[PDB]
Design an enzyme around this catalytic site. Structure first.
Site, PDB file in Angstrom:
ATOM      1  N   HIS A 478      45.383  79.371   1.489  1.00  0.00           N
ATOM      2  CA  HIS A 478      46.077  78.872   2.657  1.00  0.00           C
ATOM      3  C   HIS A 478      45.098  78.533   3.772  1.00  0.00           C
ATOM      4  O   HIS A 478      44.910  77.350   4.074  1.00  0.00           O
ATOM      5  CB  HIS A 478      47.102  79.909   3.087  1.00  0.00           C
ATOM      6  CG  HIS A 478      47.945  79.472   4.231  1.00  0.00           C
ATOM      7  ND1 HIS A 478      48.483  80.362   5.132  1.00  0.00           N
ATOM      8  CD2 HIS A 478      48.342  78.241   4.627  1.00  0.00           C
ATOM      9  CE1 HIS A 478      49.175  79.697   6.038  1.00  0.00           C
ATOM     10  NE2 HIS A 478      49.105  78.407   5.756  1.00  0.00           N
ATOM     11  N   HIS A 483      44.273  74.568   6.274  1.00  0.00           N
ATOM     12  CA  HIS A 483      43.963  74.510   7.705  1.00  0.00           C
ATOM     13  C   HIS A 483      42.498  74.180   7.996  1.00  0.00           C
ATOM     14  O   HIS A 483      42.193  73.226   8.722  1.00  0.00           O
ATOM     15  CB  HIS A 483      44.310  75.845   8.358  1.00  0.00           C
ATOM     16  CG  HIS A 483      45.772  76.136   8.392  1.00  0.00           C
ATOM     17  ND1 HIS A 483      46.512  76.078   9.553  1.00  0.00           N
ATOM     18  CD2 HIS A 483      46.637  76.471   7.408  1.00  0.00           C
ATOM     19  CE1 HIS A 483      47.770  76.373   9.284  1.00  0.00           C
ATOM     20  NE2 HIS A 483      47.873  76.616   7.990  1.00  0.00           N
ATOM     21  N   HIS A 669      49.570  72.256   1.020  1.00  0.00           N
ATOM     22  CA  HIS A 669      49.860  73.217   2.075  1.00  0.00           C
ATOM     23  C   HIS A 669      51.309  73.683   2.001  1.00  0.00           C
ATOM     24  O   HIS A 669      51.600  74.868   2.199  1.00  0.00           O
ATOM     25  CB  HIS A 669      49.565  72.628   3.447  1.00  0.00           C
ATOM     26  CG  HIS A 669      50.049  73.487   4.574  1.00  0.00           C
ATOM     27  ND1 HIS A 669      51.228  73.238   5.240  1.00  0.00           N
ATOM     28  CD2 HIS A 669      49.537  74.613   5.125  1.00  0.00           C
ATOM     29  CE1 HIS A 669      51.413  74.161   6.166  1.00  0.00           C
ATOM     30  NE2 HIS A 669      50.401  75.008   6.118  1.00  0.00           N
ATOM     31  N   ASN A 673      52.486  77.525   1.606  1.00  0.00           N
ATOM     32  CA  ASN A 673      52.884  78.051   2.900  1.00  0.00           C
ATOM     33  C   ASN A 673      54.345  78.476   2.970  1.00  0.00           C
ATOM     34  O   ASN A 673      54.645  79.569   3.460  1.00  0.00           O
ATOM     35  CB  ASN A 673      52.623  77.032   4.001  1.00  0.00           C
ATOM     36  CG  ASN A 673      52.974  77.571   5.356  1.00  0.00           C
ATOM     37  OD1 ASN A 673      52.267  78.422   5.893  1.00  0.00           O
ATOM     38  ND2 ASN A 673      54.094  77.115   5.905  1.00  0.00           N
ATOM     39  N   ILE A 818      52.098  74.056  10.614  1.00  0.00           N
ATOM     40  CA  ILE A 818      52.459  75.442  10.924  1.00  0.00           C
ATOM     41  C   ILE A 818      51.628  76.311   9.985  1.00  0.00           C
ATOM     42  O   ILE A 818      51.330  77.472  10.257  1.00  0.00           O
ATOM     43  CB  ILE A 818      53.963  75.676  10.796  1.00  0.00           C
ATOM     44  CG1 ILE A 818      54.356  77.064  11.321  1.00  0.00           C
ATOM     45  CG2 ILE A 818      54.434  75.559   9.361  1.00  0.00           C
ATOM     46  CD1 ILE A 818      53.938  77.342  12.738  1.00  0.00           C
TER      47      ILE A 818
HETATM   48 FE   LIG Z   1      49.830  76.924   7.294  1.00  0.00          FE
END
Ligand SMILES: [Fe+3]
Length: 818
Positions: A478, A483, A669, A673, A818
């Site tokens: 993750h 990110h 993602h 996520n 997010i």
């Molecule tokens: Fe995330």
């Protein structure tokens, strides 16, 4: 003669968490010619023109939007407008949506898509400039706009110095030297990640606050971590500002929870599994002043149901919605490795025993101690199983062994480096057949058992495995792979691809909110004593462990087919539609993923040829070449010497690079996520930490294991207080904001004037609707129930493209939002 225009904007108050003041001489626009140049070759600039009046007679307006009339004097010497300046003389900034110039025909309408905050003119070194929605590679830019195009890019790059302020639009790189807090306490010092061979790491967005007093290499703290202004997304509804919830959780909510445990207002530990289930049934009872600190906070207040006095109630996790105990089964343990929160680590096994690549001088013999004869392979021999490619493993041995000694020295952390062996049964489901628990410098093999103290040892063995998996999932699958790996490409795009550029328009929707959530994460999630350090096993070693894994990160291996082959769960096969044959046919993440991958591939393949006819055109695009050069050499600069970087000299290279970027930011993602709370909201299913090793025979800890297996489990995994914080965190991260933009959508339908690109995008969106129906049918196919639903009866919807707002276990956003 006179050109009618309409300006749509949003006043500041609408996007936070008086309309006549815009009239008069408050806001000036000046049109810029695309076809007539002054003596120096620059597009002629028109006169300052002010907003004339409000336009309430417009039906297309959205929430919070206001429209103003304007009329430009534009005579025959001025040509065709292609850009405009805007100057805000008000004291308060506003969000400019669009400018539309009307003409005699609908073809002669000129659209400007802006979506940018405009601060008072005195705060800007250069006047804000905006371009019409025509797309141009650099060599096709109308000559009078060439210098404007390059000057705006120079403005976005800055000069590499200075403290960045809220209204700056300056993109640049820095290392991760802003996570430690040594000026507050020497124990909060952290290594600088990036810019060394010891600790390679992707770069992040430069903030420029300057050095701490105690360490010149560490960046001092600030109350706000800058992102370039238009990255800092406003929301119409405060409940959609999910990114700020992590800040409140760390700075307000966590100290409140901690106070309740200090005062012994609630039991310090869970004592039974029921105490955990209670969290989403009758709730947890807390003092009134703790509740009254929590429930007035935006975002935070949406995470729980409360009676306003003593109760906080968490939502029921999907994984227990049908069966409260199915998580304990071997079948679900195995199934979540292909259809869980972290479905991308399992590997095919082609030799036995598995071997370690670690230095025997430091760690010891690291040959596996699992023997072939101890395994129940449903009547298969080891030879047969290997040859039919039915053996798989979840191998965390080499990843964790270098850190086990340091972790186990901490006060309330104890872990093993684990391996799990899995067998693919004839019915198509995976069966765990052994777990090896290793320490450096005893190291045990644990075999499945359903009865007796051995069945409890096996349950605890699975928990140590999932502690490994949780840490790897949060920090690597993750945080690192989505990110952190994506932010350098965001920075490079804005610094080197004009808003006019076709590749800017292709990629930037897949960046929405990425830099913003990352900056908030540097401040409250991955910082020293932040949420992750406080709730996950490795404490202060968490982020640096992701640096060790980054050493082996390979951009071209992030492509889904390449990943499946590298891990030995698929083989190359041209007879198949996707070019790969899955060795686990029913593999839900991979089988659904390949459908999404292919649709994105088709979109990119149909868009790039609209602007690049030959490999020559790719090589000769100087913005594209500067972009890719900087993204590799600065953005991922600790890996710049690696041979696997595409060179970007061909159409094929350009398609591959864009496809990988879009894949990481959307479907990858999303797949790792949005299952976090659905699977991990029950802490026993996804423990984030382990606190002790296996009890030794003849100790009271061992006797407890015999008489009370639930208490032995709960004493091993994450303690109650960090459980409450981590559940709140992953509830936030698993929620879709109502203003999300999903794959196949864009925020404005006139993002380009090119009808060919618009039609190809329409086709992409239609294909995604077709695929969603295909995936729905897979979840209703009884032959695939075993892996797609499992004993928990939870259909795999994480790669459905569409979703409503909330905690839905489905939906693919465009971006890492997010
Ligand atoms: Fe995330």
């Amino acid at each position: 003669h006179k050109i009618k225009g309409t300006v749509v904007l949003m006043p500041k108050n609408e996007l936070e968490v008086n309309l006549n003041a815009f009239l008069g001489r408050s806001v000036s626009l000046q049109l810029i010619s695309a076809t007539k140049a002054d003596a120096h070759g620059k597009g002629k600039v028109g006169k300052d023109t002010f907003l004339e009046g409000i336009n309430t007679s417009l039906p297309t307006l959205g929430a919070g939007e206001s429209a103003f009339n304007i009329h430009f004097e534009w005579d025959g010497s001025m040509g065709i407008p292609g850009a405009f300046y805007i100057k805000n003389y008000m004291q308060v900034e506003f969000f400019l949506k669009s400018l539309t110039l009307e003409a005699i025909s609908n073809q002669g309408t000129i659209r400007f898509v802006c979506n940018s905050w405009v601060y008072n003119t005195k705060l800007y070194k250069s006047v804000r400039i905006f371009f019409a929605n025509h797309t141009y590679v650099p060599s096709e830019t109308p000559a009078p706009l060439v210098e404007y195009r390059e000057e705006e890019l120079k403005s976005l790059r800055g000069n590499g110095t200075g403290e960045r302020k809220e209204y700056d639009r300056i993109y640049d790189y820095d290392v991760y030297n802003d996570l430690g807090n040594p000026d507050k306490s020497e124990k909060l010092a952290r290594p600088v990640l990036g810019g060394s061979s010891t600790f390679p790491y992707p770069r992040r967005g430069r903030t420029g606050r300057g050095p701490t007093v105690t360490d010149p290499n560490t960046e001092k703290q600030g109350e706000v971590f800058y992102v370039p202004r238009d990255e800092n997304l406003g929301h119409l509804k405060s409940k959609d500002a999910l990114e700020i919830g992590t800040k409140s959780l760390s700075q307000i909510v966590q100290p409140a929870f901690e106070s309740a445990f200090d005062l012994k207002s609630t039991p310090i530990e869970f004592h039974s599994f029921q105490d955990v289930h209670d969290l989403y049934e009758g709730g947890i009872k807390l003092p009134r002043d703790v509740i009254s600190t929590i429930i007035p906070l935006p975002v935070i207040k949406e995470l729980y149901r409360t009676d306003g006095q003593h109760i906080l109630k968490f939502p029921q996790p999907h994984v227990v919605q049908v069966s409260q105990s199915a998580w304990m089964t071997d079948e679900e343990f195995a199934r979540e490795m292909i259809a869980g929160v972290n479905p991308c680590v399992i590997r095919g096994l082609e030799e036995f025993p598995p071997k370690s690549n670690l230095d025997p001088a430091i760690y010891g013999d690291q040959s596996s101690k699992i023997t072939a004869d101890s395994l129940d392979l449903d009547g298969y021999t080891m030879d047969e199983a290997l040859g039919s490619r039915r053996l798989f493993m979840l191998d965390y041995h080499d990843i964790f062994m270098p850190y086990v000694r340091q972790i186990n020295q901490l006060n309330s952390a104890k872990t093993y480096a684990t391996r799990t062996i899995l067998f693919l049964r004839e019915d198509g489901t995976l069966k765990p057949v052994a777990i090896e628990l290793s320490l450096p410098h005893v190291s045990q093999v644990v075999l499945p058992a359903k009865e007796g103290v051995e069945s409890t040892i096996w349950l605890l063995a699975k928990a140590y495995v999932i502690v490994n998996d949780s840490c790897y999932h949060q920090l690597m699958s993750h945080w690192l792979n989505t990110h952190a790996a994506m932010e350098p490409f965001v920075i490079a795009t804005h610094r080197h691809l004009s808003v006019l550029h076709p590749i800017y328009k292709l990629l930037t929707p897949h960046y929405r909110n990425n830099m913003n959530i990352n900056a908030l994460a540097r401040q409250s999630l991955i910082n020293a004593n932040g949420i992750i350090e406080t709730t996950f096993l490795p404490s202060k070693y968490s982020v640096e462990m992701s640096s060790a894994v980054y050493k082996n990160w390979v951009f071209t291996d992030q492509a889904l087919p390449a990943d499946l082959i590298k891990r030995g769960v698929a083989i190359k096969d041209p007879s198949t539609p996707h070019g790969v044959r899955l060795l686990i046919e029913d593999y839900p993440y991979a089988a659904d993923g390949l459908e999404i991958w292919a649709a994105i591939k088709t979109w990119v393949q149909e868009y790039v040829p609209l602007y690049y006819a030959r490999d020559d055109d790719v090589k000769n695009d100087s913005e594209l070449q500067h972009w890719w050069k900087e993204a590799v050499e600065k953005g991922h600069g600790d890996l710049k010497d690696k041979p696997w970087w595409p060179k970007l000299q061909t159409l094929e290279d350009l398609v591959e690079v864009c496809l990988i970027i879009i894949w990481i930011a959307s479907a990858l993602h999303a797949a790792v996520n949005f299952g976090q709370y659905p699977y991990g909201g029950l802490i026993m299913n996804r423990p984030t930490a382990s606190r002790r090793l296996l009890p030794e025979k003849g100790t009271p800890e061992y006797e407890e294991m015999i008489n009370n297996h639930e208490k032995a489990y709960l004493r091993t995994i994450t303690s109650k207080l960090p459980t409450l914080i981590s559940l709140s965190a992953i509830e936030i991260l698993s929620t879709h904001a109502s203003d999300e933009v999903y794959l196949g959508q864009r925020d404005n339908p006139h993002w380009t004037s090119d009808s060919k690109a618009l039609q190809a995008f329409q086709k992409f969106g239609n294909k995604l609707k077709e695929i969603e129906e295909k995936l729905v049918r897979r979840n209703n196919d009884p032959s695939l129930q075993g892996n797609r639903l499992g004993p928990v009866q939870l259909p795999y919807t994480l790669l459905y493209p569409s979703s409503e707002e909330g905690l839905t276990f489905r939906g693919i956003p465009n971006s890492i939002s997010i």
